C-alpha cells in the first residue's frame, strides 16, 4: 500500500508547513515590535511591510488550496484509488512546493529585517557565525527548491503520458521533506536572532 503511504505523508508535510507558518508569523510579530521600539525613538520598512503582506497572503491561499487537495486525495483513496488519485498527488506536490517557495520569500524578508535591527542595535563573534549559517542555509534552500522544481516538471510531463512516475513521486516527497527541514533550521536561526536582539535592547 504505497499510494496510501504517500497521501498520509503529504498530510504530515502539510501539517509541517502549517506549524512552520505559525512560527514564521510569530517572527514577523517579533520583528515588527522591535522595529516599532527602535523607531520611537530615534522608512523603506514600508516596502518591506508591503512585501510581507504579499507573501503572507499567498501562503494563506496556497495552504487552503493544499488543505482542499488533501481532503480530495483522502476521499479518492477511500473510494478505491489510482487514476485521479495519482494526478491529485502530483498536484499536491505542486501545492506544497509553491507553499515552500512563498515561505522562503518570507524567510529572506525576516532575515533582512533582523539585519536592519542588528545594524542599529550593535557579542560581535556569535553574530558573524550566525551570518555564515544564514548564508549557507539560504544557499542550500535555493538548490533544494531548484531540485524540487526540476523533479516536479518531470513528474508532470510523465503524468501526461501514462506511467517511473511512481518513483519520481517518491523522490519528490523526499525533495520536499528536505526543503522543509532546511527551512526549519533557517527559522530556528531567525528565532535566535530575534531573541538575541531583544536581550541586547535591555542592556
Amino acid at each position, epitope marked *: 500500500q504505497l499510494l496510501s503511504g504517500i497521501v498520509q505523508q503529504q498530510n504530515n508535510l502539510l501539517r509541517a508547513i502549517e506549524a512552520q507558518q*505559525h512560527l514564521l508569523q*510569530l517572527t514577523v*510579530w517579533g520583528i*515588527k515590535q522591535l*522595529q*516599532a521600539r527602535i523607531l520611537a525613538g530615534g522608512t523603506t520598512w514600508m516596502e518591506w511591510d508591503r512585501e*510581507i503582506n504579499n507573501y503572507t497572503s499567498l501562503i494563506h491561499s496556497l495552504i487552503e488550496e493544499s488543505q482542499n487537495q488533501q481532503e480530495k486525495n483522502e476521499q479518492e483513496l477511500l473510494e478505491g484509488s489510482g487514476g485521479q488519485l495519482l494526478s491529485g498527488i502530483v498536484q499536491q506536490q505542486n501545492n506544497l512546493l509553491r507553499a515552500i517557495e512563498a515561505q522562503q520569500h518570507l524567510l529572506q524578508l525576516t532575515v533582512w529585517g533582523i539585519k536592519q535591527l542588528q545594524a542599529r542595535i550593535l557579542g560581535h563573534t556569535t553574530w558573524m557565525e550566525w551570518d555564515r549559517e544564514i548564508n549557507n542555509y539560504t544557499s542550500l534552500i535555493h538548490s533544494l527548491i531548484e531540485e524540487s522544481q526540476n523533479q516536479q516538471e518531470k513528474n508532470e510531463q510523465e503524468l501526461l503520458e501514462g506511467s517511473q512516475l511512481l518513483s519520481g513521486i517518491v523522490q519528490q516527497q523526499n525533495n520536499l521533506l528536505r526543503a522543509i527541514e532546511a527551512q526549519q533550521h533557517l527559522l530556528q536561526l531567525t528565532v535566535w536572532g530575534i*531573541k538575541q536582539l531583544q*536581550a541586547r535592547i535591555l542592556a
Partner: antibody
Amino acid sequence: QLVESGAEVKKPGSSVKVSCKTSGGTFNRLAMSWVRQAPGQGLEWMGGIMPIFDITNYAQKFQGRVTIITDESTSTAYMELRSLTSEDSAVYYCARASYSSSSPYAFDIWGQGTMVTVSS
Amino acid sequence: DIQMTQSPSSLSPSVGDRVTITCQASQDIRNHLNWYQQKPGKAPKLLIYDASNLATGVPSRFSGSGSGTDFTFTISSLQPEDLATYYCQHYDDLPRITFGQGTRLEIKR
C-alpha cells in the same frame, strides 16, 4: 484552547492572581494577551506575551501593578494585578492571538473570563 | 493616543436588515483594525481582522472595510442570533491596543 480560574472577592489593598490553562501545552509557539472588561464600561488590553522571544508587554496605565507569567510545566498562564482599587472590579480574559493577522493582537481564542470584585 | 470613536452607540434593526457600523481613528492607522462580536455573558469573538479579512469559520454575511482613519463593519442581512455588542480594536506593534466603545443591537420584532 483556554480555561480560566474561578471568580473571586479581594480586599481593596490586595492583589489578585488569575490563571489560564491551555490544552496545547507550549507557550513557545503562541502570542497571548490579557484583556479586561470593567462595567462600566468597555474593553481594556492590560498586556501581552511572546514567550519565545522572552517578550512581555504591559499597558502604560497598568505598568507597575501587573505581572504576566507562563508556566510550561503546568501549561498555565498567570496574570497578577496588585494594589487593587474599587476601579479594578472587572471580568478578566486571557486570549490567544490569531496566526492570520499581521500582528499578535487579533484575539481569536478566548477564556471564559474571571470575575473579580474588589470589596472588603 | 490613539483615539478611536465608534458610531453609532446603538441600533434597532429588523431581522433581515443590513446594518453598518463605523470606527474613526484620530491619526492614520493603515489597516490595523479588528472587529469583534460579544454576546451577553459570553467572551468576544473575532469576526474581522486587519480591516477587511473574514476570520475562519465566520459566516459570509460579515465583512469589513477601510484604510486610513475611516473604517466600516457590515452585516449584509441580520439574523436573530447576530444579537450582540460589536467592537472595533486598533492595534499597534509598539504595542498600543485601543478598543472602540461598542455598538449595541436591539432587534425589532
